[PDB]
Swiss-Prot record, chain A:
GO process terms (BP): DNA-templated transcription
Enzyme Commission identifier(s): 2.7.7.6
Native organism: Thermus thermophilus (strain ATCC 27634 / DSM 579 / HB8)
The protein's role, per its UniProt record: Promotes RNA polymerase assembly. Latches the N- and C-terminal regions of the beta' subunit thereby facilitating its interaction with the beta and alpha subunits.
Organism lineage string: Bacteria, Thermotogati, Deinococcota, Deinococci, Thermales
Subunit annotation: The RNAP catalytic core consists of 2 alpha, 1 beta, 1 beta' and 1 omega subunit. When a sigma factor is associated with the core the holoenzyme is formed, which can initiate transcription.
Any single GO CC term annotated in Swiss-Prot or TrEMBL for this entry: DNA-directed RNA polymerase complex
Pfam families: RNA_pol_Rpb6
SMART domains: RNA_pol_Rpb6 (SM01409)
InterPro entries registered for this protein in UniProt: DNA-dir_RNA_pol_omega, Pol_omega/Rpo6/RPB6, RPB6/omega-like_sf
Protein name, per record: DNA-directed RNA polymerase subunit omega
Curated annotation (Swiss-Prot), chain D:
Family membership: Belongs to the RNA polymerase beta' chain family.
Protein's organism: Thermus thermophilus (strain ATCC 27634 / DSM 579 / HB8)
Domain of life, source organism: Bacteria
Shown residues within the full chain: 796 to 908 of 1524
Oligomeric and partner information: The RNAP catalytic core consists of 2 alpha, 1 beta, 1 beta' and 1 omega subunit. When a sigma factor is associated with the core the holoenzyme is formed, which can initiate transcription.
Protein name: DNA-directed RNA polymerase subunit beta'
Known role: DNA-dependent RNA polymerase catalyzes the transcription of DNA into RNA using the four ribonucleoside triphosphates as substrates.
Swiss-Prot record, chains F, H:
Domain comment, as recorded: The N-terminal domain is essential for RNAP assembly and basal transcription, whereas the C-terminal domain is involved in interaction with transcriptional regulators and with upstream promoter elements.
Keyword Transcription included in the entry's annotation: yes
Family named by the database record: Belongs to the RNA polymerase alpha chain family.
Subunit structure as annotated in this protein's UniProt entry: Homodimer. The RNAP catalytic core consists of 2 alpha, 1 beta, 1 beta' and 1 omega subunit. When a sigma factor is associated with the core the holoenzyme is formed, which can initiate transcription.
UniProt key word Nucleus: no
Provenance organism: Thermus thermophilus (strain ATCC 27634 / DSM 579 / HB8)
Lineage: Bacteria, Thermotogati, Deinococcota, Deinococci, Thermales
A GO CC annotation given for this chain: DNA-directed RNA polymerase complex
The enzyme's E.C. designation: 2.7.7.6
Protein name: DNA-directed RNA polymerase subunit alpha
Curated annotation (Swiss-Prot), chain G:
Highest taxon, organism lineage: Bacteria
Assembly information from the UniProt record: The RNAP catalytic core consists of 2 alpha, 1 beta, 1 beta' and 1 omega subunit. When a sigma factor is associated with the core the holoenzyme is formed, which can initiate transcription.
Name the record gives this protein: DNA-directed RNA polymerase subunit beta
Signal sequence, start to end: none
Organismal lineage: Bacteria, Thermotogati, Deinococcota, Deinococci, Thermales
The encoding gene: rpoB
Family named by the database record: Belongs to the RNA polymerase beta chain family.
Chain's role: DNA-dependent RNA polymerase catalyzes the transcription of DNA into RNA using the four ribonucleoside triphosphates as substrates.
Length: 91, 97, 48, 113, 57, 229, 49, 229
């Protein structure tokens, strides 16, 4: 499975919020590339044959591994939404 | 079992413990020598088997025999109609080949 | 072409015990009689 | 499993009954999985310190998984079969804690669906 | 023209991906279920027995 | 060569203390995972030498199902707590060791509370044997021998005192072993075997040396076919 | 035997006689009348299915 | 070498011909009869190298599903019959052999009709192959190779001629194996094990040679535990 799904469900009220949060993080990771991560220095996912999970084998697991830390914050309206939602789609 | 004895073999210890277990399960009447106990077990159509992966016999007897098994008609039904991109229809563009 | 029995194929007896081959085991690990003869096909009693 | 009791099953009272009925099991007087009054000769004959010891003795073909016997679990003495003990251990190992596993099972009855 | 490098790449692609398995008469919500694919050598689809009742399969 | 030689099955070890050992052999050719695991498991559970508390005699005990005044634990509970005591001999010459225990006063009796002997050692000194209610007359002794596998108390009947009682012996140091064979795969083929072997041991012998003893015993047993008759 | 006989899938000897020639695809048989008759074989014939 | 080697099996043999051989190992300490029998049986039935028909070429036909005029059997029947042909090598270094066969007229073509080769023998000369009636000419080449295990026809893909047709290979000289453990008595211990294993093979390898090969295979596989890391 994934690291501590029970912890994931405990820390959100409703699951659909969890899904939209993780997927929006995944889309952000894709658009900016995997440089905009907040678990970079030591704990990074790792493949078996090589270290391929450093770059991009699966972004969803990247986002979920990110969220288990306290480095992710999500809310209904924490930032002026219009600016972000109209810069997201043109790059 | 006559062919078995012709080579000079009695009853395997695994067979012995299987017989005792079947005796505890009421399959075979107790108080009899392993010969006739195993014969009565055979009369039920069940014989001792060995697992092969472990070598230890399967606890309790197993029913074995010969069955007539036929292979059924086997067309593309098994074959994988797995496509990634194919012909589309003319009226609607829903893909069908 | 000479179709050979494999996992996808299916078998049946004359009593309708429909079935599908699920795994082909190597000869050594299949159950065998006290004599060296190994059985050919293993059937689940649950269907009876 | 249970088969038969052809001997005087009365056992709660006499402490000579342990030796006498052990002799009876030595003969064919009483089977191992017998229907004694209070206890079967299985619980008297064999007692196990840990589930590991019970299952190890099972591996040596001493006792079947369907035979009740006295086992000293985490805090108590139980008259259970090694099969039920193994079932409990399976549940407790699939999960992390064992107290929770012990409290969420019923190890006194067959595991029907 | 297949190569073992090709199958290495195929295993690389599906490391975290999932696929939806479906049964034809979809009586309820459980007739569609996602799974992690595992590449196998054969023709048939290997199915976990415990979903033998989720599907009427 | 990866087909057979470069797949000299890599032998990875995961040791969690002196009790738990996981060993993964990978990759292995088809069908050999069981062929290796099964005899190894049987050898581990059957032939590993070790020591166990063969029997015990207590001063005031006449029957094995009696109750000791001054101690809440009965004879059954006392021997049951005695079963899991593990002792390692220091030199190979030792065959049998009789160790006594004198104890009185309202205190706990544990493994470390046994009188020391130079040529034996106890890996679990804090093993709580029993409790003394109030000046409990605890005058007992245990005879401990070396053996293999598991010995029911009934058949051997080792006797030291006329009133002494037999104790079932668990000589095998390994608590239990479980081996799984899982179909691994190579780059090109899937018909390969991954052998994971998990060993739990009391602590007398580390799992590594237990496995080494097992493979050595199997190899020497194989060498029995060299001379035909 | 009745099914294989009545469904004309096999070949049968219409009269007492002795086999003359047997090959992979044809069989020539000389009956007791002195008349020899040739039976060809559909060696590998595709079915309907 | 007496408490553990004289209380360890003498290794006797009872073999007749080169097809049937019983190997008795008596007496074993309890718990080793299966422990040795099972791995040996698995290895014998799995990884005993042998020789089997690999490729077939016919001067006349051009694919598998044709038929030769003058031949009662189809090409399918000919290949199926060839599948049971047993080939014994006399030079271990020799790997691939190409037997030739030419026949004509009313010939009940058996296995003996193959042209002799320097270091090849047919342990089953009476194996029927074909039935030529009259005017039928049968010229054929059979390429036999030494291998191990079982391989599908297309898997190996051997093509010396454009017209050649590969066949499946069954590289196992061992026909079947059956090991049985019984009880034998020794003065100190009544219940000891006697392990007798009976091997039927196809003649290419005498049972004793197969047993020695299997023992060596198991020993060298146990060798993989020698170097941990």
């Amino acid at each position: 499975a994934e690291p501590g799904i029970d912890k994931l469900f405990g820390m959100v009220d409703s699951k659909y919020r969890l899904t939209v949060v993780v997927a929006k993080r995944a889309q952000q990771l894709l658009r900016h590339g995997f440089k905009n991560t907040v678990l970079e220095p030591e704990e990074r996912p790792k493949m078996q044959t090589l270290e391929g999970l450093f770059d991009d084998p699966n972004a969803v697991t990247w986002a979920m591994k990110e969220l288990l830390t306290g480095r992710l914050v999500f809310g209904e309206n924490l930032v002026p939404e219009d600016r972000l939602q109209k810069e997201m789609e043109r790059l | 079992f006559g062919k078995r004895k012709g080579e000079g073999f009695g009853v395997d210890k695994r067979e012995v413990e299987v017989l005792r277990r079947a005796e505890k399960l009421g399959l075979v009447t107790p108080g009899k020598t392993p010969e006739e106990q195993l014969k009565e077990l055979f009369l039920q159509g069940k014989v001792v088997l060995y697992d092969g992966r472990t070598g230890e016999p399967i606890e309790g007897p197993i029913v074995v025999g010969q069955m007539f098994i036929m292979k059924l008609y086997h067309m593309v039904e098994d074959k994988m109609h797995a496509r990634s991109t194919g012909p589309y229809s003319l009226i609607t563009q829903q893909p069908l080949g | 072409q000479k179709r050979k029995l494999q996992v996808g194929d299916k078998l049946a007896n004359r009593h309708g015990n429909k079935g599908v081959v699920a795994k082909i085991l190597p000869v050594e690990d299949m159950p065998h009689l006290p004599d060296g003869t190994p059985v050919d096909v293993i059937l689940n009693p649950l269907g009876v | 499993r249970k088969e038969k009791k052809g001997a005087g099953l009365e056992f709660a009272t006499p402490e000579e009954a342990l030796a006498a009925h052990e002799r009876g099991e030595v003969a064919l007087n009483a089977p191992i999985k017998v229907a004694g009054r209070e206890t079967s000769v299985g619980r008297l004959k064999y007692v196990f310190a840990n589930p590991d010891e019970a299952l190890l003795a099972v591996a040596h073909g001493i006792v079947d998984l369907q035979d009740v016997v006295t086992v000293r679990y985490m805090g108590k003495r139980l008259e259970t079969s090694p099969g039920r003990i193994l079932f409990a251990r399976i549940v407790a190992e699939a999960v992390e804690d064992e107290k929770v596993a012990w409290e969420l099972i019923q190890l006194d009855v067959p595991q029907e669906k | 023209d297949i190569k073992d490098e090709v199958w290495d790449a195929l295993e690389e692609v599906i490391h975290g991906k999932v696929v939806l398995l479906n049964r034809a008469p979809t009586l309820h919500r459980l007739g569609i279920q996602a799974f992690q694919p595992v590449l196998v050598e054969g023709q048939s689809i290997q199915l976990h027995p415990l979903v033998c009742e989720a599907f009427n399969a | 060569m990866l087909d057979s030689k470069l797949k000299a099955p890599v032998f990875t070890v995961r040791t969690q203390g002196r009790e738990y050992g996981e060993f993964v052999l990978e990759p292995l050719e088809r069908g050999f995972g069981v062929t290796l695991g099964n005899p190894l498991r049987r050898i581990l559970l059957s032939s590993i030498p070790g020591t166990a508390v063969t029997s015990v005699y207590i001063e005031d005990v006449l029957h094995e199902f009696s109750t000791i005044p001054g101690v809440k634990e009965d004879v059954v509970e006392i021997i049951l707590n005695l079963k899991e005591l593990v002792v390692r001999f220091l030199n190979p010459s030792l065959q049998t060791v009789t160790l006594l225990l004198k104890a009185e006063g309202p205190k706990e009796v544990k493994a470390r509370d046994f009188l020391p002997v130079a040529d034996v050692e106890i890996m679990n000194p804090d093993l709580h044997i029993a409790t003394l209610e109030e000046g409990g007359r605890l005058n007992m002794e245990v005879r401990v021998d070396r053996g293999v596998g598991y010995v029911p108390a009934e058949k051997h009947g080792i006797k030291d005192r006329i009133n002494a009682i037999p104790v079932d012996a668990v000589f095998s140091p390994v608590r239990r072993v479980a081996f799984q064979v899982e179909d691994t795969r190579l780059g090109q083929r899937t018909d390969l075997d991954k052998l994971t072997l998990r060993i739990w041991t009391d602590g007398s012998v580390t799992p590594l040396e237990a496995l080494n003893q097992a493979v050595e015993i199997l190899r020497e047993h194989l060498t029995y076919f060299s001379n035909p008759q | 035997e009745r099914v294989v006989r009545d469904s004309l899938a096999a070949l049968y000897a219409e009269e007492d006689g002795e086999v003359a020639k047997v090959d992979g695809n044809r069989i020539v048989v000389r009956y007791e009348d002195g008349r020899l008759v040739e039976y060809p074989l559909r060696r590998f014939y595709r079915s309907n299915q």
